[PDB]
Enzyme design. Structure first.
Site, PDB file in Angstrom:
ATOM      1  N   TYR G  47       0.780  -1.233   0.000  1.00 22.41           N
ATOM      2  CA  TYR G  47       0.000   0.000   0.000  1.00 22.41           C
ATOM      3  C   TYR G  47       0.808   1.277   0.000  1.00 22.41           C
ATOM      4  O   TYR G  47       0.296   2.335  -0.354  1.00 22.41           O
ATOM      5  CB  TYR G  47      -0.953   0.038   1.176  1.00 22.41           C
ATOM      6  N   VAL G  71       1.235  -9.579  -2.314  1.00 23.13           N
ATOM      7  CA  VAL G  71      -0.038  -9.274  -1.682  1.00 23.13           C
ATOM      8  C   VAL G  71      -0.879 -10.537  -1.636  1.00 23.13           C
ATOM      9  O   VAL G  71      -1.499 -10.948  -2.617  1.00 23.13           O
ATOM     10  CB  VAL G  71      -0.781  -8.134  -2.394  1.00 23.13           C
ATOM     11  N   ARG G  78      -9.562  -9.280   3.809  1.00 24.22           N
ATOM     12  CA  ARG G  78      -9.523  -9.289   2.359  1.00 24.22           C
ATOM     13  C   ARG G  78      -8.399  -8.383   1.876  1.00 24.22           C
ATOM     14  O   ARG G  78      -8.317  -7.216   2.243  1.00 24.22           O
ATOM     15  CB  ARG G  78     -10.861  -8.832   1.795  1.00 24.22           C
TER      16      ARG G  78
END
Ligand code: NA
Ligand code: NA
Ligand code: NA
Ligand code: NA
Ligand code: NA
Ligand code: NA
Ligand code: NA
Lengths: 147, 147, 148, 148, 147, 148, 148, 147, 146, 148
Positions: G47, G71, G78
């Site tokens: 991120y 990821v 989630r």
């Protein structure tokens, strides 16, 4: 090596279903030279296959049975419920009748009435037909080795 | 030879399936020293395991039966119907003959006939074969301990 | 004012650290609630797939008023689990209808579960719940079947 | 005329499943006025229904059996495996005992133990209860009809 | 000539009916009205399997038809029942030897809106006809074997 | 060696979102000895985070922003749409303002208001909060290095 | 000629991500014998990659930027939301700064922290790292081709 | 007591329900701000027409916060998610642009088949959400003012 | 005259090429060699949007075509990149106001088999054609306006 | 004075999309005493709609723009990516130009080119076409009401 195989095929998507029957009988008779006799039975839908497979299997005339059908997501109603009932059906019939029932009752991930699709499968079902044949033979054989 | 085990392996993906059959036979020996002898029965596809399992089980010759096959999502048609009919079928067959049917009829979440994937399962089935080997020895034991 | 009976607890060797929790817990409650009145006999079976049959074999001995299949059936990220889970959950069902001997299911399949202190801990602990419940269910159904 | 109905309900989510039962009973009460007797039978979970129904069904005492349970997704373990075995199981029994086994073993799509959700089904199960009764009466008469 | 047991669920009658209506119609047209079609109302699809079995067992019908519109209620999960039923018939027809054609349809989508409703009201007429063309089809095919 | 961090937290599931805030706010102090101040900004729901972060970031008082929320699937309406708009939103705001915006806007695979669930996340957000705390010191310090 | 690449990588799953970094730098050298300079940058998680990439691209010092992170679906929360936000971020950033930003921010279908998977990805990332190198030399070249 | 204007944009679709949120929204605000907070409604065709309206309204500066209200169900015929996304994202985009809080009461239920029970449930549940929107409305407006 | 930029990702070149070749074939056909199709090779689909932009900005091209086979490799998810790309071109085209057509296809199913590879090798030609027809049609339609 | 609406219809599935258009024009024609000029613009696929929409929106000639297309899961390649970019695009555009852009770019759940299917949507697009007309006029009206 002389034995009978009952080939039950659904009347639906016959344009494609047949390519397998033809290829099947071909491959067969082409490695048995008439030794392996493929009787052919027409049934309305895949759903009518299992019972038919049982009745025929119980005659004790066939050393194997073949269910051929093209079970597709008709786009309107759900195919999988039948699809399941049919794959289980046969499986059940062969455990009941002790008669090998191969499944050429295929259901593709996708398939919307159209050339591109139709062609592909009309073709590929010929491969399945072949494969089926080899499998039909191999199992009937292996079974003899046992008994 | 204390007891026999029928190892019913499908033809498809033998490249990988074999890896499990090999490690299964090897482990039994490493663990039993040939005490338990494994008998291999080839079959076309996973779909022919149930009945073959039934047939063999019923001879009373084996204290356990292993079914091995690599049932994958074959890019074109759905694999579930068959797989389910198989995993369930064996389950049916063992409950019906009271002869343990261990399953090495694996279905990977993803598998695209590619170098990476192939080499993973070729390597993994080895593991799964060693586990089935142990499982068999165990359940077979556990059961004798019951009667 | 106490009645007694025998329960056969079948548990898969996989995830024993977690499964055991249900077993130990299942047993503990029946001790609290029945004080030995109800005897739990433990049977180790390899995988969850090996439960239906063992259960049937045991149920037919008629020694048990209830069979309990405990297993942690997981999605290993590698192969699909459901095929077996189904066969098992169905399998036990089949067995119980076949032997008319209650087979309770503590064969659980979490939605998600990756090996990890957080996950493991959760079920390790949660299976303790699911074990107690199984007990109350064992007692509950065994007594109810008797009434008949 | 008069016959007996065996109503098998799981103890889970009692407050809700109870609604269906009460409705079931009341409806029949109305539509039959003491003619149709509904015998209640408690059972731990939905998994415990099949066998139970199978056992009661075999007594020949009941013209129809009704399994009631609110099988939901607990959010922790997959429920369906069970729902399937239960819904299939009852079918397995009615088909092997030829005793109608009506299903009120509902599985909501979504259901988090929230007010809204709880109130909704607690309310909806009432409607389901009635339908079950009608379905019961209907299937029972339709059979005795094709039997004469 | 012969008789057919048409078991239809009461749920979604306006639609299911359209299927029965055309079924009976087609059979009259196709058999000059020589095939008696007995109608049986059952509460819901879940009630069909058993009813098929009892009727089937009476040995009065050459085939049985299970008609029901099992859709996703939006509240509860249908597929469970759907499966139990579509399977049941399969189970029942093997058990009895009497063919059980399925007109127990589970559309992908259906929210009881005008468009939707009218759509299946129209389609069930089609589906009922095929059912008819499948019943005669299978009954015939069977006897053909019985000789 | 010091700088400020804007901690934007949704009011929903404070009980859980809080455990993260606390972990974070502490872990930092307890590793920068109060040097780094963490300012808390309450906001209604996750949806209200992006804009808030943009506004705050634009003041240029914070070295980084942290959005913290528990975006659950209520079981009634779909959470993902907002969830997406939010995780993307913060990503959007951080790129606009060139001010980091760490995300503790978690979405669990499952979450039904249950004891087991609530506890598990109440305990986890604590962890997730510590990570975010480090990630903050990290990215801030890192962007600082790249600057010089 | 002599151009530089900013290789941004998350810490999470370094054991695996690193292989890609190492494969990238090594193989990149092997094709450029040190001509192409690879500058590595550490960032907490995926991120934080887009923004760093943005800031770094804007300096104009690099002919391309690489985002490296694994990821995964942690099994608890989630990942896709971020996964998305991030892949779209780099995309956005590269469009906004016209500085190629290749993605080696891989999100595998299944990956439950175990030796099984770990080894496969620890190994496969070596491939994705090599490819990333070629992809870099290719794009940076083909782009400067358009310069003429 | 502070006073500010809020722009409530509601899609005319499913006003049967959306209206319930609007009413309870204004209801609460009345009851919780004794009228110091003015809610101005703006009717708009579908959810898709909100983002633009929101932005248009936002840019005026008359509102401290905007509310987009609509029930975006799955028609059962066409996919609703594509729109639901653009709208939920759009409102996000617009609030980021205008820096005017755009609260979302553009709910999308998991299941909804215009049942009487479904309709009642949401007609009922929107009241709640509407209120919750009011609280958040005051909440954010106040939280921003403090900057 | 006017020229079009064909940005083709290299992965699955065998299959993408047909689309390219077919595109060029049809394009030259429907426009008697009046259209210049400039082929630009590029690593993967992800690299297509930015390029389509850098080019679109030159002014040189009347329309750009992204061409790639974005498949579910079976190891990592594709959809992420696929989306970022299909969105990307869409974006770059709204920015540059230069049509950017998508021949960046993601098949429902594609497992590196002979059957699949064979099918798509064929289909991409059918696609290249449609790509040409669209390019012309839209390039036309746009000028039919301004 | 007078006003025009830009109707951008995609070439694919004309038989069906055309119905939406014909009835779209039909309704507006009625509802506006023929004062609306609905200019038709054809486009290859739904993908070429957004840009056209923007190009047209900027001209300021239209008080509203409508995108019409029948985007479906062609069974061969995935449609959703494109469908998204389109639905988003139109939204991106109208937000940009501040020209209402209505979407008749419908994606049905199932559409296997069959008879029942083709007819359904041919009949349906008539409806949607009317809905779009009532919407177009409604929004243009609504906005006309905003600016005092
Ligand atoms: Na096993
Ligand atoms: Na149980
Ligand atoms: Na029922
Ligand atoms: Na009747
Ligand atoms: Na890349
Ligand atoms: Na909100
Ligand atoms: Na929302």
């Amino acid at each position: 090596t002389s034995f009978k195989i009952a080939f039950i095929q659904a009347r639906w998507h016959a344009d494609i279903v047949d390519e397998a029957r033809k290829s099947f009988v071909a491959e067969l008779a082409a490695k048995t030279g008439g030794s392996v006799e493929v009787e052919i039975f027409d049934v309305p839908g895949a759903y009518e296959i299992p019972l038919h497979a049982k009745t025929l299997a119980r005659t004790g005339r066939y050393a194997a049975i073949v269910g051929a059908a093209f079970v597709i997501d008709g786009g309107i109603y759900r195919h999988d419920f039948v699809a399941t009932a049919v794959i289980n059906g046969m499986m059940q019939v062969q455990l009941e009748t002790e008669v090998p029932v191969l499944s050429v009752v295929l259901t593709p991930h996708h398939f919307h009435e159209s050339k591109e699709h139709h062609d592909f499968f009309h073709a590929h079902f010929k491969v399945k037909g072949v494969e089926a044949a080899h499998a039909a033979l191999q199992i009937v054989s292996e079974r003899s080795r046992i008994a």
